[PDB]
Amino acid sequence: MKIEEGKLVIWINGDKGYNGLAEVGKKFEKDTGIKVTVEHPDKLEEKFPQVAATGDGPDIIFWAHDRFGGYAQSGLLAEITPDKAFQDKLYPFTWDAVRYNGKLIAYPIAVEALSLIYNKDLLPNPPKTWEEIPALDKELKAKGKSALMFNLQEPYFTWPLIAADGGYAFKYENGKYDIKDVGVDNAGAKAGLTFLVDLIKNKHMNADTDYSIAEAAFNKGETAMTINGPWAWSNIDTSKVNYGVTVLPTFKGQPSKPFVGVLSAGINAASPNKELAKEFLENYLLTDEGLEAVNKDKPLGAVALKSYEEELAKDPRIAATMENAQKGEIMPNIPQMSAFWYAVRTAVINAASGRQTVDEALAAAQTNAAAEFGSSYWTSEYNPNAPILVGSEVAYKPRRGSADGEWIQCEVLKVVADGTRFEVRDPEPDELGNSGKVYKCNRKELLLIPPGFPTKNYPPGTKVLARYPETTTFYPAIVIGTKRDGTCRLRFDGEEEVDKETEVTRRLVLPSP
Numbered sequence: 001m002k003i004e005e006g007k008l009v010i011w012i013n014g015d016k017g018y019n020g021l022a023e024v025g026k027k028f029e030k031d032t033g034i035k036v037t038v039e040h041p042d043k044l045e046e047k048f049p050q051v052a053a054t055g056d057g058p059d060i061i062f063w064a065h066d067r068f069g070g071y072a073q074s075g076l077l078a079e080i081t082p083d084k085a086f087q088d089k090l091y092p093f094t095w096d097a098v099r100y101n102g103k104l105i106a107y108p109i110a111v112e113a114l115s116l117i118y119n120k121d122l123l124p125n126p127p128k129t130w131e132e133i134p135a136l137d138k139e140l141k142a143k144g145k146s147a148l149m150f151n152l153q154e155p156y157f158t159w160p161l162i163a164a165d166g167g168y169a170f171k172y173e174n175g176k177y178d179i180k181d182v183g184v185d186n187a188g189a190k191a192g193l194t195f196l197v198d199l200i201k202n203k204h205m206n207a208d209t210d211y212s213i214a215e216a217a218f219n220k221g222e223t224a225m226t227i228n229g230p231w232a233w234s235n236i237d238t239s240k241v242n243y244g245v246t247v248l249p250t251f252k253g254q255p256s257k258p259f260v261g262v263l264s265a266g267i268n269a270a271s272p273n274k275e276l277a278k279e280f281l282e283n284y285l286l287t288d289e290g291l292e293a294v295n296k297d298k299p300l301g302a303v304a305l306k307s308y309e310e311e312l313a314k315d316p317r318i319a320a321t322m323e324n325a326q327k328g329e330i331m332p333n334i335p336q337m338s339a340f341w342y343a344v345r346t347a348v349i350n351a352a353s354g355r356q357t358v359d360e361a362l363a364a365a366q367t368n369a370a371a372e373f374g375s376s377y378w379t380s381e382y383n384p385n386a387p388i389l390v391g392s393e394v395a396y397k398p399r400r401g402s403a404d405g406e407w408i409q410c411e412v413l414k415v416v417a418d419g420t421r422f423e424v425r426d427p428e429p430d431e432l433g434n435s436g437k438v439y440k441c442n443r444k445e446l447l448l449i450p451p452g453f454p455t456k457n458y459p460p461g462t463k464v465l466a467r468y469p470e471t472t473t474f475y476p477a478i479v480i481g482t483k484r485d486g487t488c489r490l491r492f493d494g495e496e497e498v499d500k501e502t503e504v505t506r507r508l509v510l511p512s513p
């Protein structure tokens with residue numbers, strides 16, 4: 001039998017109520033005699049398909065519904081079978097969010113939408129518009145505070161601003177999303193991102209601000225505002241900050257349009273515990289008592305279960321959540337959402353860092369929003385391993401090339417075999433002295449070179465592969481330190497005598513497999 005049989009393993013993101021979920025798990029254990037294990041792995045959304053593809057992984061996976069169409073398409077999610085009476089318990093619109101190719105592929109849990117969260121003491125009257133934040137910031141800077149801080153590393157948080165004046169993902173036509181009609185590069189999208197970049201250029205925000213930094217700053221009363229979802233309210237409650245939750249600011253007179261997510265629970269198609277998982281989800285979790293346990297740990301938002309949402313509706317923070325939801329748009333769940341999110345993340349981060357102009361960033365995003373891509377077999381906490389698409393720069397290990405653990409900087413010309421194989425062009429001359437040779441390779445023979453300026457520094461001592469200055473070749477090296485600007489001080493283990501120190505751009509320093 002599969003190692004997975006005879007137990008129930010559940011994965012949910014670390015920012016949500018996993019302890020509350022485990023309480024529901026315990027109630028289930030008492031009745032069934034079966035162990036339930038709740039885990040919250042890092043990079044969950046990408047980790048799931050990694051393990052589920054081998055027939056392993058959790059029996060149940062929790063995530064916003066946008067990822068689930070891709071999971072289902074890849075054959076990773078079982079069709080669920082709630083009867084009509086169970087379906088009646090949840091809002092019809094939540095079920096629509098978990099339908100793929102006409103079949104239900106997950107149980108809806110809760111509606112999530114970003115809201116403006118503000119410190120009432122610092123800012124009793126929050127701004128109605130994005131346009132007034134610059135002035136507000138300079139006033140707060142004079143008192144050692146800032147106006148606004150939110151995660152600039154995940155495009156989820158910047159999307160409401162991009163969409164405000166006309167930006168969109170995929171156009172919905174003829175009862176379906178048109179993957180050839182992408183709106184990430186229109187006048188509206190450009191206007192939104194430009195405003196964001198201008199905030200950074202004018203020292204109103206830092207391009208390096210991530211989730212952790214933004215949350216800490218708000219919860220310590222150092223910033224007047226933040227942009228986050230219901231899950232975050234719990235930590236703010238503990239902080240003692242006198243906060244309110246309200247409608248996001250308008251941009252160019254238009255309401256901000258956050259992408260609305262439906263937190264959903266899918267069943268692993270390879271799971272030998274499917275009926276058990278159904279019972280858990282339908283009869284334990286999706287009950288007033290079950291959702292209450294999770295909600296009390298970390299607020300779920302507007303829950304899909306009507307009976308319980310009736311209790312939560314009176315909450316002004318929930319009213320604010322739904323007001324923003326109403327102004328926003330439920331995300332598509334099509335498989336192209338993975339490429340879309342990669343494209344917009346790269347564009348936002350690159351425009352923020354100055355790696356690209358807004359027009360350059362969004363032009364590339366439009367090209368790659370629905371593009372085929374692969375991932376490198378090798379993963380790291382320091383560099384992403386995806387997407388590898390046409391035009392990506394990669395480090396390639398030739399099968400009969402240079403012997404000293406060296407890789408060549410190549411360009412991806414083609415993604416084939418369902419993203420599992422690549423054609424890459426070698427700028428260096430082959431054994432016949434001819435440069436520009438195209439090679440076919442698998443996922444283990446290449447590493448993704450970041451298309452931007454990585455924010456994550458290597459700790460001293462880290463073993464790396466770095467391009468030698470003036471060359472297009474990667475050599476083994478150790479990280480000695482990191483300059484203030486992020487440049488890596490390296491010691492190439494290459495020469496035969498002295499420990500020199502060579503500076504190399506962080507983008508060209510890769511984690512050794």
Ligand SMILES: OC[C@H]1O[C@H](O[C@H]2[C@H](O)[C@@H](O)[C@@H](O)O[C@@H]2CO)[C@H](O)[C@@H](O)[C@@H]1O
Binds near residue numbers: 229341
């Ligand atoms: O940023 C791109 C990202 O956005 C969404 O992920 C959200 C998630 O839905 C929230 O519940 C919370 O965990 O924050 C995430 C962003 O950091 C999409 O669901 C996801 O697919 C997408 O990659």
Ligand SMILES: N=C(N)c1ccc(CO)cc1
Binds near residue numbers: 088306310
């Ligand atoms: N809790 C409610 N008010 C509720 C309303 C409507 C329905 C669907 O008829 C279920 C529940």
Ligand code: NA
Binds near residue numbers: 045154
């Ligand atoms: Na994500």
Ligand code: NA
Binds near residue numbers: 167169257259329
């Ligand atoms: Na939108």
Ligand code: NA
Binds near residue numbers: 250253254
């Ligand atoms: Na207005």
Ligand code: NA
Binds near residue numbers: 283
């Ligand atoms: Na039953």
Ligand code: NA
Binds near residue numbers: 476477478
């Ligand atoms: Na090394």
